[PDB]
Amino acid sequence: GSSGSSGSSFQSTTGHCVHMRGLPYRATENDIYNFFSPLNPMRVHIEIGPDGRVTGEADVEFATHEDAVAAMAKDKANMQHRYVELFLNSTAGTSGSGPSSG
Structure with missing residues (x-):
């Protein structure tokens, strides 16, 4: 199968994601x-x-x-008239460069 959206196993889609909580009733995508x-x-x-x-x-x-x-800059910031909680959830790759790459 595997068409789109739905699939099998977690398989990190990308890694960088943001969770939302405490959203307003009149809040739409x-x-x-x-x-x-x-x-x-x-x-x-x-x-x-x-x-x-x-x-x-x-x-x-x-x-x-x-x-x-x-x-995430809009974390806590009231979207409409409520305070939605934003949780920065990412995997992040690799970084950091030094002298003579060991």
Whole structure:
């Protein structure tokens, strides 16, 4: 199978992600998009409680890490009239350059 979105195993999609919590009832992706702008979130997942009512949680995915930290800049910042919690979740690659690469 494996078409898109759904699949098997965790298999880190990218690594750099952002968790959302305590979101407003009148909060929509479109907002979650401008709430992190200027930026481009790979995708904003909206967690639904029953079958329509939101839960206040969301998941933001980014191509790179920067996009994350950049989005993390809006951590706590009230999106509309509520305080959503943003948890910086990334994997980060490798870095650090010195003399004569050992």
